[PDB]
Design an enzyme around this catalytic site. Structure first.
Site, mmCIF file in Angstrom:
data_model
loop_
_atom_site.group_PDB
_atom_site.id
_atom_site.type_symbol
_atom_site.label_atom_id
_atom_site.label_comp_id
_atom_site.label_asym_id
_atom_site.label_seq_id
_atom_site.Cartn_x
_atom_site.Cartn_y
_atom_site.Cartn_z
ATOM 1 N NE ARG A 1 52.224 -61.257 -33.737
ATOM 2 C CZ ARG A 1 51.012 -61.141 -33.200
ATOM 3 N NH1 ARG A 1 50.873 -61.145 -31.877
ATOM 4 N NH2 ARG A 1 49.945 -61.024 -33.976
ATOM 5 C CG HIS B 1 48.827 -65.791 -24.717
ATOM 6 N ND1 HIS B 1 48.715 -65.220 -23.463
ATOM 7 C CD2 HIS B 1 50.074 -66.314 -24.777
ATOM 8 C CE1 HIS B 1 49.850 -65.399 -22.798
ATOM 9 N NE2 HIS B 1 50.684 -66.058 -23.575
ATOM 10 C CD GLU C 1 68.635 -90.854 -29.289
ATOM 11 O OE1 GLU C 1 67.927 -90.860 -28.256
ATOM 12 O OE2 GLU C 1 69.166 -91.891 -29.753
ATOM 13 N N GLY D 1 58.007 -77.342 -19.698
ATOM 14 C CA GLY D 1 57.713 -78.764 -19.692
ATOM 15 C C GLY D 1 58.232 -79.454 -18.436
ATOM 16 C CB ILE E 1 51.977 -75.038 -23.506
ATOM 17 C CG1 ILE E 1 51.128 -76.050 -22.723
ATOM 18 C CG2 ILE E 1 52.398 -73.875 -22.623
ATOM 19 C CD1 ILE E 1 49.810 -75.489 -22.184
ATOM 20 C CG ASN F 1 53.309 -68.473 -26.870
ATOM 21 O OD1 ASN F 1 52.094 -68.563 -26.713
ATOM 22 N ND2 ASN F 1 54.129 -68.066 -25.911
ATOM 23 N N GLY G 1 57.935 -82.243 -24.860
ATOM 24 C CA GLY G 1 58.641 -80.990 -24.679
ATOM 25 C C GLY G 1 59.009 -80.866 -23.215
HETATM 26 N N1 NAP Z 1 51.418 -69.630 -23.074
HETATM 27 C C1 NAP Z 1 52.328 -69.568 -22.089
HETATM 28 O O1 NAP Z 1 51.953 -69.108 -21.007
HETATM 29 C C2 NAP Z 1 53.711 -70.031 -22.316
HETATM 30 C C3 NAP Z 1 54.676 -69.972 -21.278
HETATM 31 C C4 NAP Z 1 55.972 -70.386 -21.428
HETATM 32 C C5 NAP Z 1 56.370 -70.897 -22.646
HETATM 33 N N2 NAP Z 1 55.455 -70.988 -23.726
HETATM 34 C C6 NAP Z 1 55.785 -71.500 -25.055
HETATM 35 O O2 NAP Z 1 56.057 -72.910 -25.070
HETATM 36 C C7 NAP Z 1 57.265 -73.182 -25.764
HETATM 37 C C8 NAP Z 1 58.363 -73.661 -24.792
HETATM 38 O O3 NAP Z 1 58.791 -72.638 -23.884
HETATM 39 P P1 NAP Z 1 60.135 -72.786 -23.048
HETATM 40 O O4 NAP Z 1 60.403 -71.601 -22.216
HETATM 41 O O5 NAP Z 1 59.910 -74.069 -22.282
HETATM 42 O O6 NAP Z 1 61.423 -73.003 -24.058
HETATM 43 P P2 NAP Z 1 62.714 -73.864 -23.844
HETATM 44 O O7 NAP Z 1 62.506 -74.354 -22.539
HETATM 45 O O8 NAP Z 1 64.105 -73.221 -23.803
HETATM 46 O O9 NAP Z 1 62.695 -75.254 -24.671
HETATM 47 C C9 NAP Z 1 61.519 -75.989 -25.001
HETATM 48 C C10 NAP Z 1 62.092 -77.223 -25.403
HETATM 49 O O10 NAP Z 1 61.632 -77.130 -26.802
HETATM 50 C C11 NAP Z 1 61.770 -78.350 -27.606
HETATM 51 N N3 NAP Z 1 62.113 -77.990 -29.100
HETATM 52 C C12 NAP Z 1 62.766 -76.921 -29.611
HETATM 53 N N4 NAP Z 1 62.916 -76.979 -30.873
HETATM 54 C C13 NAP Z 1 62.355 -78.181 -31.262
HETATM 55 C C14 NAP Z 1 62.189 -78.843 -32.536
HETATM 56 N N5 NAP Z 1 62.632 -78.330 -33.683
HETATM 57 N N6 NAP Z 1 61.548 -80.046 -32.566
HETATM 58 C C15 NAP Z 1 61.079 -80.611 -31.416
HETATM 59 N N7 NAP Z 1 61.208 -80.066 -30.182
HETATM 60 C C16 NAP Z 1 61.831 -78.818 -30.207
HETATM 61 C C17 NAP Z 1 62.982 -78.817 -26.942
HETATM 62 O O11 NAP Z 1 63.402 -80.041 -27.345
HETATM 63 P P3 NAP Z 1 64.948 -80.479 -27.123
HETATM 64 O O12 NAP Z 1 65.407 -80.111 -25.818
HETATM 65 O O13 NAP Z 1 64.688 -81.859 -27.439
HETATM 66 O O14 NAP Z 1 65.725 -79.792 -28.238
HETATM 67 C C18 NAP Z 1 62.637 -78.580 -25.632
HETATM 68 O O15 NAP Z 1 61.503 -79.527 -25.163
HETATM 69 C C19 NAP Z 1 57.575 -71.884 -26.540
HETATM 70 O O16 NAP Z 1 57.025 -71.846 -27.867
HETATM 71 C C20 NAP Z 1 57.001 -70.783 -25.695
HETATM 72 O O17 NAP Z 1 56.607 -69.646 -26.403
HETATM 73 C C21 NAP Z 1 54.117 -70.560 -23.596
#
Ligand code: NAP
Ligand code: NAP
Lengths: 307, 307
Positions: free
Chosen positions: A92, A178, A35, A13, A121, A123, A7
């Site tokens: 949710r 959380h 990909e 990430g 990480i 949610n 990710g």
């Molecule tokens: N606990 C915390 O403090 C915290 C903080 C921030 C975020 N998060 C969580 O972590 C996740 C990512 O957050 P974000 O802000 O980084 O979002 P985001 O940047 O806009 O995108 C995350 C990215 O998600 C992958 N993805 C999306 N749909 C996918 C699928 N069907 N199969 C495989 N990979 C998929 C993407 O792959 P591609 O680019 O390959 O499509 C890409 O790596 C979320 O669920 C969010 O709630 C948690």
């Protein structure tokens, strides 16, 4: 150390990748994405190499799609940040089921290659950690999630600010979900080692206002954000620090009336992951709220378990 | 910042000088000693200049005898380390009276020149702080002594080692006399913010063995010594950190049945010195022991008061 981030093409990430690459203990850093993300990941790798230019770092950065996870073999920890973030218009449960399928597939694929530690990480983190534990079939000490670690740090800053003392003098934590059902542990909050209850100023603490702030801005950068919090845990593992952080972990009776669920709790972290869930007596109101929180989470776990 | 060290020719004075000279906030460092020590102090200054060679430090080091203290004017803090150390064959009362005359003379001479903060290191530290406060006629927030600060740090290391947790997770302190009547505050000891009493392992803590170690080796280097502890307090002042350290300070009723004495106690330290003595409820055994400790110290204070 070898770390894989599934990710890495996403916001958290990519930020985590940049921070980890600068660590002295970092040897092999693997960036996995779908990909269609390879070009973006190659661009991220060049950015990282530019940032490392001038230093004597000997870390290798790899970019690979998620079709063949052979590359993750021997990883010390695999961080999963793949998932759809807080949808503007969705429940949710829909979020839980949607991401359950993503995290679960990766957990199962990882387990086909090797035994390793999975740091979740995505949610709802407590539910996604549980799903990763179920699909990977790993031991309970090998799978965990960020949980309320950053929430607890935010709470620490708020309390230090209210009492007018150095941040170092405050040690506190929030357990539970959380999310909106988090539980601040005032019974486990000290100022200079002294129980917070022993201060006259404690009576005027805006607990409700502060918690409202943690619930809505908890994942935002502190004037230190999610990426820094993740590095904090990774360093605790590679350095076998033995800190008592608050992470999403599997519980089986450590807190009477709570089992078969992953939820933010105090744990001792080391090179072997969650080396133990620290169980302690909570005050009346805290245990009631904690059970409530566990019940909310258990429902989601039961609904995504078989997905 | 401008710091004066009276007693710089001695072991702790010279070590402290070396450490302070390396600090970025250090501008003027004054080293005072008796006339027969000037050559040794000039030698110490050359050693410091060699250690600073290569860096871009713009600190000035002065060497002067104690005949004319005009040079200490405008000092932010004056550290007094002059005094005869633990005599191999002598009582504590003889030590108290002997050093009372030394510290008292310097306190009075300092006050003739300017108003400043006095940090007392010479033993018996609690008694010498009191004598310095009496002879200088300064406000109670301007005069303090190292007290049980280093003792408390040593205790912290022992507890962290026993529980097998990172040092950062332990916050504790010892109050009372920097001597055999010190009082460990288990009621104000937390592990990860959790009261130490809430751990089953607490029942097996070798409190007696540990305290015996702190009483006899308390002033030794920790595999961090007296010099490092002094720098810790100086940094807390110049940086207005607001930490809750445990130093020898004047008390006037903050702990029922205790007044007109200087003794190790929790205080909030900042740019204005002892900004407040933190009073909190102690457990039965702690308050009894603390009163006992205060009574022992009060006797010495009464005997050196008029010297
Ligand atoms: N606990 C915390 O403090 C915290 C903080 C921030 C975020 N998060 C969580 O972590 C996740 C990512 O957050 P974000 O802000 O980084 O979002 P985001 O940047 O806009 O995108 C995350 C990215 O998600 C992958 N993805 C999306 N749909 C996918 C699928 N069907 N199969 C495989 N990979 C998929 C993407 O792959 P591609 O680019 O390959 O499509 C890409 O790596 C979320 O669920 C969010 O709630 C948690
Ligand atoms: N609380 C703590 O953790 C701690 C730790 C270490 C030491 N101390 C205390 O601090 C003091 C110094 O310790 P130390 O190991 O540094 O001893 P020391 O090095 O052997 O000598 C201290 C030095 O004492 C001065 N001095 C001695 N007699 C004097 C007098 N009559 N008038 C003026 N100055 C006099 C010396 O001046 P000249 O060289 O000019 O004669 C010299 O600066 C002692 O009282 C000791 O107990 C406290």
């Amino acid at each position: 150390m070898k770390v894989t981030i599934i990710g890495a093409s996403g916001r958290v990430g990519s930020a985590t990748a940049l921070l980890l690459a600068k660590e002295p203990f970092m040897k092999d850093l693997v960036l996995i994405g779908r990909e269609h993300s390879i070009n973006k990941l190659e661009g991220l790798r060049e950015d990282i190499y530019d940032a490392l230019a001038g230093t004597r770092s000997d870390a290798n950065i790899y970019v690979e799609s998620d079709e063949n996870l052979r590359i993750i073999d021997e990883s010390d920890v695999v961080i999963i940040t793949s998932g759809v973030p807080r949808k503007e218009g969705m429940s949710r449960m829909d979020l839980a089921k949607t991401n359950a399928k993503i995290v679960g597939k990766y957990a199962k694929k990882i387990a086909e290659i090797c035994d390793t530690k999975i740091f979740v990480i995505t949610n709802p983190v407590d539910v996604m950690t549980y799903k990763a534990l179920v699909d990977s079939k790993f031991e309970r000490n090998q799978v965990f999630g960020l949980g309320t670690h950053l929430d607890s740090l935010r709470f620490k800053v708020a309390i230090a600010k209210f009492f007018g003392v150095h941040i170092d003098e405050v040690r506190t934590r929030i357990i539970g979900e959380h999310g909106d059902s988090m539980v601040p542990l005032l019974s486990a909050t000290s100022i200079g080692g002294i129980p917070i209850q022993k201060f006259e100023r404690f009576k005027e603490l805006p607990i409700d206002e502060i918690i409202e702030d943690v619930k809505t801005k908890g994942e935002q950068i502190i004037r230190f954000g999610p990426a820094a919090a993740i590095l904090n845990v990774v360093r605790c593992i590679v350095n076998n620090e033995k800190r008592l952080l608050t992470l999403s972990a599997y519980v089986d009776g450590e807190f009477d009336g709570i089992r078969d669920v992953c939820i933010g709790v105090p744990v001792k972290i080391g090179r072997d992951g969650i080396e133990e869930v620290v169980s302690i007596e909570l005050d009346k109101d805290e245990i009631i709220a904690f059970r409530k929180s566990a019940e909310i989470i258990k429902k989601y776990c039961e609904e995504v378990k078989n997905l």
